[PDB]
Amino acid sequence: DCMFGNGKGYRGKRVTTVTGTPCQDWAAQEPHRHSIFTPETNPRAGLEKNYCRNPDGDVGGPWCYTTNPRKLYDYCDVPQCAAP
Amino acid sequence: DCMFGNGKGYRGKRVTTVTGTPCQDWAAQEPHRHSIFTPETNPRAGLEKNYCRNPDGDVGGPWCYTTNPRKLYDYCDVPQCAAP
Numbered sequence: 001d002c003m004f005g006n007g008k009g010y011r012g013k014r015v016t017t018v019t020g021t022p023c024q025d026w027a028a029q030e031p032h033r034h035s036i037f038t039p040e041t042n043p044r045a046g047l048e049k050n051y052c053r054n055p056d057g058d059v060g061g062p063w064c065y066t067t068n069p070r071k072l073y074d075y076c077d078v079p080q081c082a083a084p
Numbered sequence: 085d086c087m088f089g090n091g092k093g094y095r096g097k098r099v100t101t102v103t104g105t106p107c108q109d110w111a112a113q114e115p116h117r118h119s120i121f122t123p124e125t126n127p128r129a130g131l132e133k134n135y136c137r138n139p140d141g142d143v144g145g146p147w148c149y150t151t152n153p154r155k156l157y158d159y160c161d162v163p164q165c166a167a168p
Binding site: 002004005006017018019059060061063071073074075077079080081082083 | 086088089090101102103143144145147155157158159161163164165166167
């Protein structure tokens with residue numbers, strides 16, 4: 001369970017942010033509403049359940065909306081696949 | 085101990101690749117000889133001890149030469165710092 005590059009292609013099952021806070025499901029609008037990055041706005045980004053994803057190829061890598069009421073989003077720690 | 089972006093500015097003290105192999109010192113020429121990426125070729129990149137670094141700002145983030153005589157180099161796992 002690892003990514004290549006910035007992980008725009010990453011479809012792994014990591015669900016935890018770098019602080020320990022779980023991800024919010026992409027389909028959920030609670031605790032956090034989100035007008036962007038829903039499974040309907042980004043249908044080919046693999047926004048399934050609450051997996052860490054990088055739908056916009058952010059320089060920071062895979063992230064998610066967090067269940068922390070006070071923090072909207074955060075990065076996840078998804079390792080780089082070992083070099084061949 | 086975390087980075088921003090692709091980790092070109094990361095100056096932490098992580099020293100293990102994603103497989104758990106201790107990194108080789110940048111100054112060292114064993115177990116792997118390397119004429120590029122030493123403290124005396126990239127003096128502004130913080131190629132110190134065997135700390136994971138991204139001197140060229142490669143998409144895959146921080147890496148190092150490895151102490152594994154059969155693996156030249158590999159990525160390290162340096163987490164993005166928590167989002168501000």
